[PDB]
Amino acid sequence: FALAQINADDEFIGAIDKESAEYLDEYATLARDISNSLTLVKAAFGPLER
Amino acid sequence: EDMAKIYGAVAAVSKNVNSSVTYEVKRGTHELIKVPTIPHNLVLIQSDNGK
């Protein structure tokens, strides 16, 4: 009922550009961490019995 | 650097293998004492006249 117009000024667009770099960095780090952890599991541990 | 960490963790697991056990077998063994004299429990009773 009280919907308001979204104002996309320069500051908000500039803020998102900073977040885009931060998001890209985070994804790269997680992929490296996932790859390292997947290699550790294969070399170290094995199957489990009863 | 992260490869040295992964390789170090694997070597830690492989080094957790047990070799053997060592213990002493002493149950059932008791020390021995030495008795120096033989108990005879004998006394000679003789009358005054020797009869």
Q: Which of A32, A33, A37, A40 to mutate to test the interface with B (most CBs of B within 10 A)?
A: A40
Task: Count Cβ neighbours within 10 Å for each residue of B28-47 and write b for 16 or more, e otherwise.
Answer: eeeeeeeeeeeeeeeeeeee
Listed resolution, Å? 4.8
* Contact B42/A at CB under 8 A: no
CA distance A49 to chain B (A): 18
C-alpha dist (Å) from residue A24 to A10, A19, A38, B2, B32:
21, 8, 21, 21, 83
Q: What are the φ/ψ torsions at residue B48 (nearest 5 degrees)?
A: -65, -40
A-facing residues of B in 3-22 (CB < 8 A) are 6, 9-10, 13
Place of tokens 């004492």: B33
What is the DSSP annotation of A1-50?
Answer: ----PPP--HHHHHHHHHHHHHHHHHHHHHHHHHHHHHHHHHHH------
Q: Give residue B7's identity as a one-letter amino acid code.
A: Y
Best CA proximity match to A36, nearest among B38, B32, B3: B3
